[PDB]
Design a protein around this ligand. Structure first.
Ligand SMILES: CCCCCCCCCCCCCCCCCC(=O)OC[C@H](CO[C@@H]1O[C@H](CO[C@H]2O[C@H](CO)[C@H](O)[C@H](O)[C@H]2O)[C@H](O)[C@H](O)[C@H]1O)OC(=O)CCCCCCCCCCCCCCCCC
Ligand code: CLA
Ligand code: CLA
Ligand code: CLA
Ligand code: CLA
Ligand code: CLA
Ligand SMILES: C=Cc1c(C)c2cc3nc(c4c5[nH]c(cc6nc(cc1[nH]2)C(C)=C6CC)c(C)c5C(=O)[C@@H]4C(=O)OC)[C@@H](CCC(=O)OC/C=C(\C)CCC[C@H](C)CCC[C@H](C)CCCC(C)C)[C@@H]3C
Ligand SMILES: CC(C)=CCC/C(C)=C\CC/C(C)=C\CC/C(C)=C\CC/C(C)=C\CC/C(C)=C\CC/C(C)=C\CC/C(C)=C\CC/C(C)=C\CC1=CC(=O)C(C)=C(C)C1=O
Ligand SMILES: CCCCCCCCCCCCCCCCCC(=O)OC[C@H](CO[C@@H]1O[C@H](CO)[C@H](O)[C@H](O)[C@H]1O)OC(=O)CCCCCCCCCCCCCCCCC
Ligand SMILES: CC1=C(/C=C/C(C)=C/C=C/C(C)=C/C=C/C=C(C)/C=C/C=C(C)/C=C/C2=C(C)CCCC2(C)C)C(C)(C)CCC1
Ligand SMILES: [Fe+2]
Lengths: 80, 341, 38, 32, 34, 34, 30, 36, 27, 50, 29, 62, 504, 30
């Protein structure tokens, strides 16, 4: 009772689904192509299943520094 | 009527979700924290801070995902994205636990913003700010545990992580390392929370079973319009029910509902005082009088010394995995083990 | 001179003022458009 | 032990017969 | 970068065809506030 | 006779546009081979 | 135990117990 | 406005949920995090 | 497939309820 | 384990459902399951305790 | 000194006895 | 009521109650000192934290 | 009548009896500081500040007197190491006696202001009501604060007329009271640089003098007076409680993290000096600086000070005691009599093994002897039947260098294992568990206890700030909301703005 | 101003203290 269009009147209007049958699937596809095209593994630095360890090495690539810590992660990544 | 008055109008404008002056501080920060939890639990690993998988991308489920704490080497670094550790790099910042401090500080500022909102709305709707006063107990729990406890410890690493199983780590951490069950300030919190949940269940079922018959239907919820000024339930019957069932009853409905404010808020405030003590490792770990008794008597067993044997189990079996920075290399023979297990 | 974490603090404090100032720039803007009728 | 067993057994059944008979002695009647 | 042009291409195709249906309904609401 | 782009529209969409994006992203994770 | 372990509790029971009983006899008496 | 019956929206948005959580619970057993 | 069974098993529940709505039947 | 736990979940709720329905059906046969009548409230007609 | 302090619990039962049977009664007002 | 000797020497120091300065006053001059304190405390926060590292400022005992 | 928790609210509209209740609180605080320091004098053992300093004895207020120049006693002892000194009046006795003499004087002043509440100074001349000009009162007190901030910084702390403050070397060996010059560059915001602590008080004292002069001569805005309810003194309470919990959070941090204000000869080592092995690195830095001079190990370790190796011991970590493990640190391990020496662990191979030191989290910690190349070479096993790395199996001997046991080597594995469970604690010390019944259960230092009180006070004062700010902004409504509160006031969309009846 | 403390507040406030001291006596004796 504050002024906005009621939720019984928006999602039931067909103009909503003119908009949202092509934006709700589009963002589900956009999010799919975030993970499927590999961009998720590159924005955030989460390793791939073949990127936790080097081929023979099995140590945890653990941060031991603070101001030499961004370069330390890169040393672990150049190891992969 | 200048621009502060005009911005006061639009902020306090009567809408669906009330923005207010607190919404400048609540609505980004509460949304960056919760949006950053979901970003960290979906997409961010703990492979360099903890050596863990903690995102949906790695294979974890909702129970096992977390935004894990920074490494111990970070210390209590604020871990700004522009700060000296991340150096601007977003990909590096998520790996160094920067999203944990993003959530623990925006979530800190949003909880100020929600508590300020509770003041601001109560000042506009004309009511007393007791919901803000009752919200001081989730503030003090969030402040003591996610902020004050790691600040007392060596780093953010020993704070709880924003995750279901990671909180479960943190509960089992505090049993093994702090004996936090035995702490009297946690028991006042258990008495406050379970007292709150009891007073939620009792007062809810007492009202719902002392209702006045105001409608001719067998489903009683449509016998209440809110503009009425009648008591919807019989507080006299409710007092006579509990006086003979339990012995004592509320007879003041204002004192009842203050006691409902009082009991979980004093409990969560008492648990805060214990966790602030546990930040400095001021545990009620041991009753000195009993471990004097049990160290020269090998037959005096209580459930207390059994719990302490369990904590030695937790502190040596969990720690080479829970605390990877320490490089705990515990051999297969230093591990405290009972017979056959 | 300016250490590399000093200009980080500058970048953050100016981004934090781009974040704060443009927030209130839009909130001043929408309030000037949506004045309440008295 | 031989004596306290039947002592408890009589005490139990007397309170239980008091339970069963009093709910058989018109408990639907005792409503306002 | 190519992948960020495929994560954002259904998104920019979403908001465009979203703004292609409420286009006259936006010009009626901004005008009514002004 | 209602507005379209309210404050509530921003409260709805700033949550529910990345929610659907994330639900498409978590549903793509269910098919990642090991 | 602590030899100040009962005085820590007797002055924890009785110090507010004297206080709440003093308060009750001065408001019973009106 | 009220053209579409709201139950049809409420029965297929609620079916969007159980398809996705049914897809999420299937991927518990498939791929990463399946212990296999 | 198992899904196209469970799709048409699942869809044709509310289609009973869809028909009795669009025929004004005894819903 | 599946059979004991499922038939404990079910058997406890069926005790709760007994307590629900036995309380209600005796409140229904006596005439106060919809609430207390305000004009004839029993406790204001019931004597005090202390 | 230990147990006879703890047996504070006897004060609680006396308070449990007093607050049930000797409470200032609720008054219908 | 008891008009004492020290009550008179400090009577001008308690005889301006509620005399507000009109308008928004010096609130802009205060808000720009509200903000500089916020930047100052954040400087000394980040120095102590070793977030802000400075030339010749070693935040350690040695 | 009044509720029991509302009994002090008879002083809001009574400024003269607010001053008296304040004078009595200040009398009790100054009385406690005299009473605590005299009790601390009665229990301080001063004859060994090397191995039994004030933070080992649970001396609470003895380091706060010490850190601003108060160094000697009328008894004759100075804490810096000398005996026979005449420190004049300002001893630990004379400071404490000045606080008791203050407390009696604030008592009688409180007695005067309680009876003579009804002074015309509180009464407003235009309305006859007892009124406090809280803006002008604030600028007067802010001027006095900055006068006493500047003068403490620029006379006491600088030493020009005053003692100075406690200064230290970073490892806290030859720390004393010196005059400190102000640091005016960016190194003055280093909290461990004491020149900034002097230069803070000079600079913040001037800015507080400048602002104190501002709030005297500039009145509040009409909209800042009414937003805060500056006529009410509950707003001075809610913003002062807001200040003192911020300030107690700061002193909780600067005690816990350490600063120049909180030195380690007075409050003890911090927990972070054990986390970094900050004294162990320094101890090995000195030893290798004689291992390259040619000075042998027994020589190169008998030159380590006993005070330095005492800082490298986990029973001085403040994160090592417990909430009801009460009393001095000497109630735990004991009184340190002498350093037993640096235990060097060698196996039957004669290759040096390094004990895994215990972190402050752990109550129990397994004794595990790694080498310089990290691989575990010996341990005290829990299960000993299927063992491989026991002290008996691997032939582990322990040799001591410096200290009591300088040139002693223990090879018999029960005596090696006893010294190994003490080498997880750092440097091994010989404790007097007979002076004060020391049961081995580790205690907390005055650094750890102060942080506990002042971060639990600061949290408890967070609620008090919230409560009293609630009482200020909502003063009309703490009897309750309006009976004539309209249903159309909280109804949605009856007003265009929430709270305002002109926007319908 | 007089202080009012009704008998329930004597009863709860004694209950508050006695169950506080039943708690903390185990720790004060330690
Ligand atoms: C957000 C707050 C960030 C923070 O707190 O960051 C903490 C920093 C201090 O940094 C810490 O400092 C410690 C002490 O280091 C010092 O000591 C070590 C050994 O001596 C090292 O050698 C090091 O060089 C030297 O700087 C450790 O090194 C840690 O790495 C580091 O986290 O202080 C600061 O930024 C400012 C802190 C001062 C105000 C305190 C506010 C905290 C509120 C109360 C909580 C106190 C804790 C008790 C809990 C109860
Ligand atoms: C079984 C009984 C029991 C009960 C009732 C409690 C109750 C509590 N525990 Mg305890 N606990 C228990 C057993 C129990 N515990 C056991 C056996 C252990 C192992 C020793 C623990 C270990 C433990 C730890 C480690 C901690 C607690 C804490 C607490 C307090 C939680 C406060 C809270 O709500 O945080 C919840 C969070 C908030 C209130 C902040 C909310 C912020 C906003 C409002 C949220 C908005 C979003 C998906 C999307 C989500 C509460 C008193 C905590 C505590 O002491 O707090 C000071 C704490 O840190 N417990
Ligand atoms: C220009 C010379 C000068 C110098 C060298 C200092 C130096 C210092 N100031 Mg000061 N300050 C000054 C002027 C100066 N100040 C002025 C003009 C004001 C305005 C009145 C202040 C207001 C001020 C405040 C409010 C605080 C300091 C604090 C400090 C200490 C910072 C390190 C720390 O422990 O923070 C730790 C505290 C924080 C990081 C606070 C955030 C939480 C350091 C001694 C801090 C302090 O005293 O701590 C012991 C502190 O809280 N200063
Ligand atoms: C009359 C002068 C006087 C003098 C010379 C002393 C001297 C001393 N007192 Mg005592 N004291 C006094 C009055 C005095 N006191 C009074 C009136 C009381 C009752 C309130 C006390 C209660 C007291 C206690 C409880 C204790 C002492 C202690 C001490 C000793 C250490 C002080 C210290 O390091 O704390 C540090 C002092 C401060 C940090 C001052 C706080 C100022 C804050 C930081 C200002 C921040 C807010 C400010 C207003 C903001 C605006 C600033 C502006 C400039 C911008 C020192 C010997 C300690 C002791 O060793 O006892 C034997 C101790 O424990 N005093
Ligand atoms: C800021 C508050 C504060 C802090 C941090 C301390 C800290 C300390 N006190 Mg002190 N004390 C204080 C206020 C404080 N005191 C007050 C207000 C009083 C008057 C009641 C005392 C009376 C006192 C005595 C008589 C003794 C101490 C002792 C101690 C030390 C042992 C810790 C302990 O047993 O506490 C335990 C804490 C709890 C059980 C919490 C409940 C520790 C350094 C002891 C000491 O070692 O002196 C040499 C000691 O014998 N204190
Ligand atoms: C300098 C700080 C300060 C000052 C001057 C006040 C003053 C006041 N408070 Mg506030 N308050 C504060 C801090 C302060 N408070 C803090 C830190 C908290 C959170 C704990 C509160 C929470 C609070 C609440 C919830 C209420 C008040 C109320 C009041 C008013 C009545 C007090 C009374 O009669 O109690 C009477 C006190 C007793 C009979 C003694 C029992 C109190 C506890 C159980 C023990 C006290 C501790 C001990 C004796 C010494 C403490 C030492 C100190 C270091 C903490 C009075 C205006 C009341 C009010 O606003 O009414 C209108 C009220 O309801 N205060
Ligand atoms: C885990 C327990 C728990 C949760 C999840 C919770 C949640 C909530 N409490 C709220 C309110 C309250 N809670 C209150 C008393 C209590 N609340 C309790 C415990 C909880 N309360 C307890 C025990 C008490 C008794 C003292 C009161 C009196 C209120 C309110 O008035 C308010 C309400 O109105 O509820 C209906 C709401 C907070 C709205 C807000 O502040 O947005 C701010 C959101 C922010 C700042 C983003 C969240 C960031 C947080 C701080 C950290 C990040 C967490 C991630 C997002 C998720 C991590 C999840 C993993 C840990 C598993 C929300 C319903
Ligand atoms: C050793 C053991 C000590 C245990 C321990 C740790 C105790 C901690 C004590 C303490 C200080 C805890 C701090 C947190 C705290 C204050 C918890 C309080 C818990 C508490 C007292 C909960 C209340 C429990 C309780 C008995 C509630 C009674 C509920 C009741 C009878 C309601 C009756 C009722 C309901 C209605 O709804 C209406 C209408 C009417 C009329 C009515 O009567
Ligand atoms: C009155 C109620 C008091 C309850 C709180 C205190 C209970 C302490 C229990 C006890 O016996 O402590 C006993 C202790 C004394 O502890 C004794 O000290 C002696 C040295 O002076 C002895 O050498 C022994 O080491 C030691 O047993 O009393 C205290 O010190 C408590 C300090 C209280 C103030 C500090 C609180 C800081 C945190 C808040
Ligand atoms: C609306 C609503 C909702 C939703 C829901 C949903 C979503 C549902 C779903 C539903 C569904 C989805 C249903 C379905 C159903 C189905 C059915 C019921 C089926 C039947 C079938 C059968 C019986 C089969 C048979 C067979 C066989 C056996 C073999 C032969 C052949 C055949 C196949 C025929 C909710 C609650 C959320 C809320 C609101 C309301
Ligand atoms: Fe209710």
């Amino acid at each position: 009772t504050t002024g906005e269009r009621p939720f019984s009147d928006i999602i039931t209007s067909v103009r909503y689904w003119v908009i949202h049958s092509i934006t709700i699937p589009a963002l589900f596809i956009a999010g799919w192509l975030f993970v499927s095209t590999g961009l998720a593994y590159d924005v955030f630095g989460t390793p791939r299943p073949d990127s936790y360890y080097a081929q023979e090495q099995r140590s945890i690539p653990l941060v031991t520094d603070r101001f030499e810590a961004k370069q330390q992660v890169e040393t672990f990544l150049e190891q992969l | 009527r200048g621009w502060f008055d005009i911005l006061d109008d639009w902020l306090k404008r009567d809408r669906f979700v009330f923005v207010g002056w607190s919404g400048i501080l609540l609505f980004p920060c509460a949304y960056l924290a919760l949006g950053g939890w979901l970003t960290g639990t979906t997409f961010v690993t703990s492979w360099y801070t903890h050596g863990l998988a903690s995102s949906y991308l790695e294979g974890c489920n909702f129970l096992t995902v977390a935004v894990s704490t920074p490494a111990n080497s970070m210390g209590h670094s604020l871990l700004l994205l522009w700060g000296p550790e991340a150096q601007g790099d977003f990909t590096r910042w998520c790996q160094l636990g920067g999203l944990w401090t993003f959530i623990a500080l925006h979530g800190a500022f949003g909880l100020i913003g929600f508590m300020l909102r509770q003041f601001e709305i109560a000042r506009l709707v004309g009511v007393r700010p007791y919901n803000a006063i009752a919200f001081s107990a989730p503030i003090a729990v969030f402040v003591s545990v996610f902020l004050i406890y790691p600040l007392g410890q060596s780093s953010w690493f020993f704070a709880p992580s924003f995750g279901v199983a990671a909180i479960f780590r943190f509960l089992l951490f505090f049993q093994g390392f702090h004996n936090w069950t035995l702490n009297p300030f946690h028991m006042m919190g258990v008495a406050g929370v379970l007292g709150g949940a009891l007073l939620c269940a009792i007062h809810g079922a007492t009202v719902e079973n002392t209702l006045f018959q105001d409608g001719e239907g067998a489903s009683t919820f449509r016998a209440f319009n809110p503009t009425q000024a009648e008591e919807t339930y019989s507080m006299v019957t409710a007092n006579r029910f509990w006086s003979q069932i339990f012995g004592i009853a509320f007879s003041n409905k204002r004192w009842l509902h203050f006691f409902m404010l009082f009991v979980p808020v004093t409990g969560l405030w008492m648990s805060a005082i214990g966790v602030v003590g546990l930040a400095l490792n001021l545990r009620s770990y041991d009753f000195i009088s009993q471990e004097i008794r049990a160290a020269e008597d090998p037959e005096f067993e209580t459930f207390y010394t059994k719990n302490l044997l369990l904590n030695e189990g937790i502190r040596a079996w969990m720690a080479p995995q829970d605390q990877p920075h320490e490089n705990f290399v515990f051999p297969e023979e230093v591990l405290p083990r009972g017979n056959a297990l | 001179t300016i250490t590399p974490s000093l200009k980080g603090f500058f970048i953050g404090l100016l981004s934090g003022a781009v974040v704060l100032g443009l927030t209130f720039a839009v909130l001043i803007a929408i309030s000037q458009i949506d004045k309440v009728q008295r | 032990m031989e004596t306290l067993k039947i002592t408890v057994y009589i005490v139990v059944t007397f309170f239980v017969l008091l339970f069963v008979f009093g709910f058989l002695s018109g408990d639907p009647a005792r409503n306002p | 970068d190519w992948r960020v042009l495929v994560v954002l291409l259904p998104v920019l195709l979403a908001a465009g065809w979203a703004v292609r249906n409420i286009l006259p309904y936006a010009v009626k609401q901004v005008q009514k506030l002004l | 006779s209602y507005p379209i782009f309210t404050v509530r529209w921003v409260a709805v969409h700033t949550l529910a546009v990345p929610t659907i994006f994330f639900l498409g992203a978590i549903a793509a994770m269910q098919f990642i081979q090991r | 135990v602590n030899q100040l372990g009962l005085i820590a509790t007797a002055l924890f029971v009785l110090v507010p117990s004297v206080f709440l009983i003093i308060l009750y006899v001065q408001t019973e008496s009106q | 406005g009220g053209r579409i019956p709201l139950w049809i929206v409420a029965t297929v948005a609620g079916m969007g949920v159980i398809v996705i959580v049914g897809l999420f619970f299937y991927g518990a057993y498939a791929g990463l995090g399946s212990s296999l | 497939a198992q899904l196209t069974m469970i799709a048409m098993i699942g869809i044709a529940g509310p289609m009973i309820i869809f028909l009795l709505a669009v025929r004004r039947g005894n819903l | 384990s599946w059979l004991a736990t499922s038939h404990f979940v079910l058997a406890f709720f069926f005790l709760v459902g007994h307590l629900w329905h036995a309380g209600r059906a005796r409140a229904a046969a006596a005439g106060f399951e919809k609430g207390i009548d305000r004009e004839s409230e029993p406790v204001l007609s019931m004597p005090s305790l202390d | 000194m230990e147990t006879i302090t703890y047996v504070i619990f006897a004060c609680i039962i006396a308070l449990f006895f007093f607050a049930i049977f000797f409470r200032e009664p609720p008054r219908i007002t | 009521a008891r008009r004492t000797w020290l009550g008179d020497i400090l009577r001008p120091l308690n005889s301006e109650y509620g005399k507000v300065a009109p308008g928004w006053g010096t609130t802009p001059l205060m808000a720009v000192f509200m903000g500089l304190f916020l930047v100052f405390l954040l400087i000394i926060l980040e120095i102590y934290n070793s977030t802000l590292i400075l030339d010749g400022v070693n935040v350690s005992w040695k | 009548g009044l509720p029991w928790y509302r009994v002090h609210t008879v002083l809001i509209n009574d400024p003269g009896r607010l001053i008296a209740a304040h004078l009595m609180h200040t009398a009790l605080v100054a009385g406690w500081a005299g009473s605590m320091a005299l009790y601390e004098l009665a229990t301080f053992d001063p004859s060994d500040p090397v191995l039994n300093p004030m933070w080992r004895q649970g001396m609470f207020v003895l380091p706060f007197m010490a850190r601003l120049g108060v160094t000697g006693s009328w008894s004759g002892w100075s804490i810096t190491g000398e005996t026979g000194i005449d420190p004049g009046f300002w001893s630990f006795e004379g400071v404490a006696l000045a606080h008791i003499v203050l407390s009696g004087l604030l008592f009688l002043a409180a007695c005067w202001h309680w009876v003579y509440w009804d002074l015309e100074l509180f009464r407003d001349p235009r309305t006859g009501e007892p009124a406090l000009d809280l803006p002008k009162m604030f600028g007067i007190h802010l001027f006095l604060a900055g006068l006493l901030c500047f003068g403490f910084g620029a006379f006491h702390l600088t030493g020009l007329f005053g003692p100075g403050m406690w200064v230290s070397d970073p490892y806290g060996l030859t720390g004393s009271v010196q005059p400190v010059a102000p640091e005016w560059g960016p190194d003055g915001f280093n909290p461990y640089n004491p020149g900034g602590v002097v230069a803070h008080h000079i600079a913040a004292g001037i800015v507080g003098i400048i602002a104190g002069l501002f709030h005297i001569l500039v009145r509040p805005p009409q909209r800042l007076y009414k937003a805060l309810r500056m006529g009410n003194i509950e707003t001075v309470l809610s913003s002062s409680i807001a200040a003192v919990f911020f300030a107690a959070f700061v002193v909780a941090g600067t005690m816990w993290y350490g600063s120049a204000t909180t030195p380690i000869e007075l409050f003890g080592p911090t927990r972070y000096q054990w986390d970094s092995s900050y004294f162990q690195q320094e101890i090995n830095r000195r030893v290798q600086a004689s291992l390259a001079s040619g000075a042998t190990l027994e020589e190169a370790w008998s030159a380590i000070p006993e005070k330095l190796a005492f800082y490298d011991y986990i029973g001085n970590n403040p994160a090592k005691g417990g909430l009801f493990r009460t009393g001095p640190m000497n109630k735990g391990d004991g009184i340190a009599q002498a350093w037993k020496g640096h235990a060097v662990f060698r196996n039957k191979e004669g290759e040096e093994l390094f004990v895994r030191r215990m972190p402050a989290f752990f109550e129990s910690f397994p004794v595990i002897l790694t080498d310089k190349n990290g691989v575990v070479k010996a341990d005290i096993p829990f299960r000993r039947a299927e063992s491989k790395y026991s002290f008996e199996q691997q032939g582990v001997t322990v040799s001591f260098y410096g200290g009591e046991l300088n040139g002693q080597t223990f090879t018999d594995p029960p005596t090696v294992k006893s010294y190994a469970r003490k080498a997880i604690f750092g440097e091994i010390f010989e404790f007097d568990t007979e002076t004060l019944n020391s049961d081995g259960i580790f205690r907390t230092s005055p650094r750890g206890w102060f942080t506990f009180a002042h971060a639990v006070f600061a949290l408890l004062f967070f609620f008090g700030h919230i409560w009293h700010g609630a009482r200020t902004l909502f003063r009309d409504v703490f009897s309750g909301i309006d009976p004539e509160l309209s249903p159309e006031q909280v109804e949605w969309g009856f007003y265009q703005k929430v709270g305002d009846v002109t926007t319908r | 101003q007089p202080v009012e403390l009704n008998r329930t507040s004597l009863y709860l406030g004694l209950l508050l203290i006695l169950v506080l001291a039943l708690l903390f006596s185990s720790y004060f004796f330690n």
